[PDB]
Design a protein around this ligand. Structure first.
Ligand SMILES: [Cl-]
Ligand SMILES: [Cl-]
Ligand SMILES: [Cl-]
Ligand SMILES: [Cl-]
Length: 278
């Protein structure tokens, strides 16, 4: 209803009050929940899989990890299923792929029936490598049994959309929504561009398709921020009634560190407030 929307908007101001005391309290709770819960990630730590992780301390929880079909530890990718508002396994949250995991990455896309990739990092930021370029600059590239062809590109102010066709050589359209303006440090000054990106990339999800693949560099901070904004917008649209903190605690059981920073937690609320007022 209008009334629960009114209470949420008021709750946002509450969190902001007293030098953001409520936001800090909320996020400290989130971090403590993560610290206290024991969630295994044995596969991520297996010696054979160590080179498949971009970061030694960003793992894939066992219970929610995406499994690749075994090949004649070939089942491992640093990726997890993550819920959306009502829908189980609405997303696959994953790291920016490495050259050594490009074949695995595209095979996962294929096997999962994924039609949309959401990328929320530049390849290099402030001279530091954040992600390897897992797609062809032009024409086609073969990544094991998957051939990926770049059909077309549209470069907007804050995001780029690349339309691919992929084919398993042992054809499907896959669209990449690539946000290109996230700052080197902190969060975006203005939420509106991110809101537009979330709305357009989320609207691209078609019926009877697999999870939307979301990644940044580690696949935790910006990735989690996207998933929470998208999911809470969908909840507001359908139900009203938002529960950002409970949703975040829940997804944090599915992939380590989703929404990594308090600044991101606050940004989520800025973005939802802008959506509500717009
Ligand atoms: Cl499992
Ligand atoms: Cl991986
Ligand atoms: Cl890296
Ligand atoms: Cl979505």
């Amino acid at each position: 209803y209008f009334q629960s929307m009114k209470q949420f908007v008021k709750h946002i101001g509450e969190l902001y009050s007293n030098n953001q005391h409520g936001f800090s309290e909320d996020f400290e709770e989130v971090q403590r929940c993560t610290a206290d819960m024991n969630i295994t990630a044995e596969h991520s730590n297996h010696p054979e899989n160590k080179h498949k992780n971009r970061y030694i301390n960003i793992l894939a929880y066992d219970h929610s990890r995406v499994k690749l079909r075994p090949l004649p530890h070939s089942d491992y990718i640093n990726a997890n299923y993550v819920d959306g508002y009502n829908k189980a396994k609405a997303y696959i949250a994953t790291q920016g792929p490495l050259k050594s995991t490009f074949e695995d990455f595209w095979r996962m896309i294929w096997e999962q029936n994924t039609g949309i990739i959401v990328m929320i990092t530049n390849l290099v930021e402030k001279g530091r490598r954040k992600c390897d370029q897992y797609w062809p600059t032009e024409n086609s590239e073969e990544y094991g049994n998957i051939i990926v062809t770049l059909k077309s590109t549209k470069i907007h102010a804050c995001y780029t959309v690349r339309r691919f066709s992929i084919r398993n050589t042992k054809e499907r359209v896959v669209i990449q929504y690539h946000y290109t303006q996230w700052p080197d440090m902190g969060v975006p000054e203005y939420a509106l561009p991110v809101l537009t990106f979330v709305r357009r990339s989320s609207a691209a999800r078609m019926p009877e398709t697999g999870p939307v693949l979301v990644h940044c560099s580690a696949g935790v901070g910006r990735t989690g921020t996207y998933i929470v904004i998208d999911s809470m917008l969908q909840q507001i649209k359908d139900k009203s009634t938002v529960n950002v903190l409970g949703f975040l605690k829940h997804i944090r059981t599915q992939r380590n560190y989703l929404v990594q920073t308090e600044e991101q937690y606050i940004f989520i609320h800025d973005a939802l407030l802008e959506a509500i007022l717009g």
